[PDB]
């Protein structure tokens, strides 16, 4: 949540099967948003986390409570 308020980053759990290109395009497509870069990592419960940085036009925090979580 903090990365969302302070960083303009959306954090998703994301398919293991999917790559940085695929994560980027799918956010871009599903959320009407532009993306700067996308870091990923495997969590220790064996699931994938994507830090998704939006471009400076977007306010990810705004975009968080529009997908509807807080």
């Amino acid at each position: 949540m903090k990365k969302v308020e302070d960083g303009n980053i959306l954090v998703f759990q994301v398919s293991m099967k999917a790559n940085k290109y695929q994560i980027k395009k799918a956010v871009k497509e599903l959320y009407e948003v532009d993306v700067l870069k996308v870091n990923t990592l495997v969590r220790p419960n064996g699931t994938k986390k994507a830090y998704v940085r939006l471009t400076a036009d977007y306010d990810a925090l705004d975009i968080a409570n529009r997908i509807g979580y807080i």
Binding site: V42, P44, N45, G46
Partner: protein
């Protein structure tokens, strides 16, 4: 260790998840018989053998 195959990472992942106590609501089920978790594992009493 400290620089693993994904194979090994995976297994370790699966392991972490099996490392909870018995979800106590099972205790309430009709004919329930499982008292506690009889397959619990602990990093310094039993080694995973990978």
């Amino acid at each position: 260790a400290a620089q693993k195959s994904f194979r090994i990472k995976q297994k370790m992942a699966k392991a972490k998840k099996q490392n909870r106590p018995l979800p106590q609501w099972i205790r309430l089920r009709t004919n329930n018989t499982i008292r506690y978790n009889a397959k619990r594992r602990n990093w310094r009493r039993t080694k995973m053998n990978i």
